């Protein structure tokens, strides 16, 4: 993780929080095991340490968020590098949480005007949201920007 952007931290931190089931800040064999075999399959509980000790940099038996972050640095995001969508997201995002929300996008459009109805804002977000949390990523926002 030589250089990253704020969004890339913030979304991966949401990933790490979603992946860490007990919120201890670490990842153990029991934790990674169940959520992986929640998704249909089942690794045979030997791949799990082979998952961790492949990536555990200090060998403490846990995966802290920096080890989690440098793993995603090797599973790096694609070549979507710009400058204006970067600037467009800062003007939109008031608190700078990295996730432009419903009421924020209502707020910015209100200062431009055009009187969006509450249902009409929900039609904007639900189509733009790829994974389905009702919030737009930085990665999701550029796909509405470039082409349809």
């Amino acid at each position: 993780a030589d250089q990253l952007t704020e969004e890339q931290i913030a979304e991966f931190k949401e990933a790490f929080s979603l992946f860490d089931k007990d919120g201890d800040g670490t990842i153990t064999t029991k934790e990674l095991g169940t959520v992986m075999r929640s998704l249909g399959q089942n690794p045979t509980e030997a791949e799990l340490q082979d998952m961790i000790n492949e990536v555990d940099a200090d060998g403490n038996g846990t995966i802290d968020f920096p080890e989690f972050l440098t793993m995603m640095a090797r599973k790096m995001k694609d070549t979507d590098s710009e400058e204006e969508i970067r600037e467009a997201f800062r003007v939109f995002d008031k608190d700078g949480n990295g996730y432009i929300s419903a009421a924020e996008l209502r707020h910015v459009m209100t200062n431009l005007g055009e009187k969006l109805t509450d249902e009409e804002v929900d039609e904007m977000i639900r189509e733009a949201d790829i994974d389905g949390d009702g919030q737009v990523n930085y990665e999701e926002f550029v796909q509405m920007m470039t082409a349809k």
Partner: protein, 647 residues
Amino acid sequence: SWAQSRDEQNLLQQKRIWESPLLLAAKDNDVQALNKLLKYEDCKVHQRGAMGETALHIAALYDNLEAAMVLMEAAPELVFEPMTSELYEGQTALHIAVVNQNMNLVRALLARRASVSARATGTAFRRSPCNLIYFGEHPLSFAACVNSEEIVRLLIEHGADIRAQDSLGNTVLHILILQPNKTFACQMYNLLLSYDRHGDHLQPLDLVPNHQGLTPFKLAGVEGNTVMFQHLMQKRKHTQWTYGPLTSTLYDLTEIDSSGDEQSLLELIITTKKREARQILDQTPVKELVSLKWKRYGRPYFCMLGAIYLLYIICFTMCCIYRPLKPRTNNRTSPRDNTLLQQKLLQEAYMTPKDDIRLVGELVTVIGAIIILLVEVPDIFRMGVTRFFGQTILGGPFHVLIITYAFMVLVTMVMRLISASGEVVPMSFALVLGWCNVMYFARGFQMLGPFTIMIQKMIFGDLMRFCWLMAVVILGFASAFYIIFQTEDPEELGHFYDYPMALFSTFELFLTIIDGPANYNVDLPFMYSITYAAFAIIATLLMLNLLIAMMGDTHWRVAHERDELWRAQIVATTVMLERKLPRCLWPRSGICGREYGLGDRWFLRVEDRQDLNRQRIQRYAQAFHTRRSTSRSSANWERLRQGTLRR
């Protein structure tokens, strides 16, 4: 005037560079010039700059590595030399190379046994809206904000403690909350706590107050750094079992209750001025809390409180409409029928069994008015005058009406004891302000009173700025009418027989109230028709209908930032009701501890249902894995696109 003297000193610096042979050769890396000038001649290198520089400072400030390395041989001591005076006091060159995010000169400077304990007590380093930064004091704190990890790490390995404090008493942690780049500084906060390996017996660095007594937990709540507030919440929640899609954690609930004297979150939330600090009430352990404080134990004492106020005012009006009255005394209407009045107010007549009933209720209003002042003795004596206005605007902007209600009741209690004549003029103000003061309870009784916020929000601002442009157009035209009907006999058209009523007369034409003066039987002068139609076309056709449209647009710019004001005002109503009410009823909220073997901390549990989000969790698992109105909505995205794009 103050900003120019700062600026003039800055241009005063550059002339010293452009005249010195040394420092101009130090601004560039003119090593050929720098070699010959130093070793040959006999000149000291203690040439102070205009803001008190040294030549060693300049190479760092214009980020020039190879020049200052030559300076180390000639100058063994100027690393130890701070800067001189009044803007950059004590700023050594170790600070400046850190601010440039590297020079690998921190290698060389710490090779020259440079102190890491210097303090930058200068003017332009203090927290102020004049400055544009706030880096604190110590070089450890300067490396904290530019987010350079190995530069931080190198400094711990040379004996730099983490418990330095500024003049405010802030630690290095408190600096990080105030930095504007939020999530990109969230990572540093975990990094520094890892170097609390020596658990000190005082407190483990996360509890240290400032000079105004604030934890770093509370400090984010004051400034609304929600993302940092989200992160510090993580170390306090304590999760129990999980059940499929269900999860039952257990929140900490210690520094967010009104138990201690510190007041601990909620009074500190409502007493700020910042708008973005109100946002914290959406976050998860707080929004759930005050709902439990309101629906249980908050609402029913509040509604039962206000009904006692309702029977108070009703009891006042009954002892208002019954007053001791005589017929008009012996003086007849001595002005020629321009003086019709008929009672003049009985003097000392109580000798009736009926008025003893009136004697009862008239005392009770006096008794209650004393109690209102007794609540408001300490409030005015402690919370300043302008400090009271800071309390005022957000959630309590009535609070003087209930004071002035207590004046006028005490005036009319005085006024009948001396028994002077003018007793009606307090009785007006003591009546309308009483019934208006029941609108304080519009917050309660349902969410069918956020109007009283908007009618506050709009009576200032909009109506206030509209009042002046009334008050001058009316001031000419009322003065215009007095000139033209000066000549006339006011037995017809008695609007305008004198000047001070003519303003009041004109005021009713402006709001389409009075009939509009016309006689149709006696000819009125020929300047009236030109002036009056010109008055009508502005006042009730241009100006007044402009008010509605100007009221129209301002209704829905604040449609969203109204509803959260209502939910904010309940919390402010809640705590004030708690503080001035004793216990042995509506107990200290949440569930008590240490019967369950946990400790004196008190808790509440929250159940919630997550989701699965199957399409996002595949790509993270494969990162582990080894070797309608659609066209309407998309046009708005196009409208979002075309308005933003370059133009």
